[PDB]
């Protein structure tokens, strides 16, 4: 019933920066509002409750302000452990409602991808399918274009991609692109190339192999 | 140390029923209000149920008639009995403790690790694990991995060399294939000089199907 809207949806920041995130409610909440942090693949963890109060053990850099409908969370000096998604929660009236979240990622310098290509295994081909995998390792920013080229014929509709969350040590991303073809179509062609374009590279990088 | 530990998830056919459990520790369970919250595949959080210090339950309309929250203050256990399950209930389910004042009208202080629920008509299918073989230039790095293909439901866990190898490992998120089955890749970057002498094995586990696989990745 009560709507919780957050701003920005996502944002990059540098360590030591002062970050402020917003939460807006559709009704007067009387400061019954908590801020939680959830890191990728982990459980939520409460930072602020009652809008202004630090929870047990929460660093002093975290502060909460607001009243009525408009509330805010502020990190005085950003730290590596502060990355993740931040949610707001109203517990003033049932049903308790959560904001959509604000993803907070770490700014860093451009980083070039290491590109690798993997031909399909003999085990798989016996099953009738052929998966060709292109790997981009440790790059920044997230944006990257991966084009498949079978015998210099650009591919479309037959590939999927997956991207990791920001690395803990280098804050880079890694990407996996899989081209799946039937074994019949796979045996019909020779050159399997993966062309990568990314801001850390001066010119696109193409990794390829010949089925023979 | 507050510890909330959930158990009891898994795969359920539509219209079925299942019970979730949350083992509380590190606090006088009886005085604290408790709640169930779930996280959808889109990663949105939805309040599912709450129970006061006086065993009074509270629900949203979406689950009102089907889910029942209960608690056994003797063993320090929170329950979520779900019935008439719908495909829209697929989500990660968390238990959460409330403030020390005992009211359900408080923040969610501590959260459990979460237990996963998938509501599907389909049967569990274990993955096919294929090697992503590395080819090398002296002084360069080589990439190897495992392709974990065609499994349902999530999740699949992957370790390398039974956990001995963690450095440089990237296990990507699962993608839904046009077939309706899931597929993930797990890769590890290693020094080229070590490829002919070091053995690399990915240990793939798919608990929904009780499927363990150990594929040894060799150069080509
Ligand atoms: Cl279904």
Author numbering:
A (entry chain B): 1 to 212
B (entry chain A): 1 to 135, 138 to 222
Publication text:
Yellow fever virus (YFV) is a re-emerging flavivirus that causes severe hepatic disease and mortality in humans. Crystallographic studies have resolved the structure of the YFV E protein and shown that its domain architecture is similar to related flaviviruses, with three N-terminal ectodomains, known as domains I (DI), II (DII) and III (DIII) and a stem anchor region known as the transmembrane domain (TM). Here we use a chimeric virus platform to resolve the first high resolution cryo-EM structures of YFV. Stark differences in particle morphology and homogeneity are observed between vaccine and virulent strains of YFV, and these are found to have significant implications on antibody recognition and neutralisation.
5A and 2C9 neutralised all three bYFVs. Next, we carried out symmetry expansion in cisTEM2 to obtain a 4 Å reconstruction of the bYFV17D asymmetric unit (ASU) complexed with Fab 2C9. This 4 Å cryo-EM map of bYFV17D:2C9 was used to build an atomic model of the ASU. We also determined a crystal structure of the free 2C9 Fab, which closely matched the cryo-EM structure.
